[PDB]
Design a protein around this ligand. Sequence first.
Ligand SMILES: CN(C)C(=O)c1cc(-c2cnc3[nH]ccc3c2)ccc1N
Ligand SMILES: CN(C)C(=O)c1cc(-c2cnc3[nH]ccc3c2)ccc1N
Lengths: 282, 282
Amino acid sequence: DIFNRDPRDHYDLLQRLGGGTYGEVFKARDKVSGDLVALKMVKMEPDDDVSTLQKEILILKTCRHANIVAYHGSYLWLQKLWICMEFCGAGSLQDIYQVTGSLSELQISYVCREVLQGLAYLHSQKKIHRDIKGANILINDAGEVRLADFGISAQIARRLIGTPYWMAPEVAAVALKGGYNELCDIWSLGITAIELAELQPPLFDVHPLRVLFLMTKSGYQPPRLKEKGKWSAAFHNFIKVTLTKSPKKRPSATKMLSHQLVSQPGLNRGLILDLLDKLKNG
Amino acid sequence: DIFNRDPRDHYDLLQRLGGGTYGEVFKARDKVSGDLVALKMVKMEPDDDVSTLQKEILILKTCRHANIVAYHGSYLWLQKLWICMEFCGAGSLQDIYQVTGSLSELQISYVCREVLQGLAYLHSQKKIHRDIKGANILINDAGEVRLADFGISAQIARRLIGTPYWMAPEVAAVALKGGYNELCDIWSLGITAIELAELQPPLFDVHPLRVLFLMTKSGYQPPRLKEKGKWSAAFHNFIKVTLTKSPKKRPSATKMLSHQLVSQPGLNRGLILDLLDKLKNG
Ligand SMILES: CN(C)C(=O)c1cc(-c2cnc3[nH]ccc3c2)ccc1N
Ligand SMILES: CN(C)C(=O)c1cc(-c2cnc3[nH]ccc3c2)ccc1N
């Protein structure tokens, strides 16, 4: 259901969102219900095909989990594709910690638990987020955690490796799946936990292609937390097991929900309400 | 050896090359020797790192084969990276057949033989071209075939899948190797032969992401030549064996140099001299 209609017939555009870090996203108010939503608008070339997204848009619609950002329908109108999603008034975690500074272990643990619940739901649906990081974890004014859109922000970028028509089936398959297994979101989550702990992912001051070269070496060591004494053993093990080099030995999302760090009691949105208070005042 | 010097100290820029299909490439005359060369200039962000290309520039330099376009040194100067290569006055095959129309089977066979000789050399060096197609096969005024630059035109685009710092080692390795084996250039060559035969690769009028979806299906059929009677059995088999779906059963570059199509006598640059004559006059 991609309503071929001007989205302004249903909603009123209020302001920009994200400051351009996710393209042109808008805070919009529903004329009817009065609710607030988010509208991500993506431009067309127009060499793009609206139907190649159908298999991806059905993915974002059939997601009945509270930790995934809700989807409310799409809109295509004058080479402009508007994705309507649940709004999260606190922005991303990256927006937050760039003001509040580093997060606490308890806050990280709650965010990790909520992200795992969304991942374990996503992987049970045999989907892969592909880009778990601070900027794709949204917070609402209730301090609740929402994974951002996935699979849609990938294809249509819209630029591959080679040239699609001359590619080989092995090259074609890898240009789509990307050598991905669901267990790479677990790695991404471990890097995100380090990101939420140290404001920056490991090797952030290193050129991107360089770090990828480093990760193919047979003696490559997965990253760690810089300050040992600052974090608990549970957090240090959570980083170790999420950052398992071999995907065969890497715990699944559900198995990680059994881990000490995220199954401990006392994890709730209040930890983020503290973080959103440290945002406005302190 | 990336001479940190204004390339105008050595050469004189004459005209643009390719019409923007390879970025800003220049026809340049050597002040000293008087020779003509090509200078591909790529802009810097400058978030790029010049040393990440070192492993790739050594690849383009240690290529002592006549079917690979020669390399003469690089130049970095004011956020501008100038790659100096052997000049090919007839442009690419895509530039040619977009004027001369389709190529003949003999012309395709000669171009395929020469490309295989370069590929078989490239693969013996354990390298992969990754993007074999009409636009990357250059012709000189002698009608000789030259494979264009490879591995350099890939990284620094300079945009990946996910975000490099949060990627997993499996994701990192695939974002670099691309699930590639040397035997995918053979597939690319078969598509190129169809391209040189029909002016367009198979499924050119189909959206790129769509054809990649089609190639992952278990019942996907590799493409063929449209006109059966127009081509010989050797050419039809050459398309079949180069377009082998499983890379395990796909012939290597050397094995393909044994094929009837490219080992037959009578293949020489005269076939392309005909094509370059059909270019200027007819
Ligand atoms: C004022 N403000 C909160 C923002 O500018 C803001 C909004 C988002 C945001 C909110 N909700 C969303 N729903 C789907 C995507 C999405 C993105 C992210 C970062 C931001 N800095
Ligand atoms: C006037 N003319 C021939 C061109 O405009 C032209 C030149 C090239 C070309 C020639 N030599 C090269 N060496 C390394 C890259 C490279 C590219 C390709 C296509 C073109 N239409």
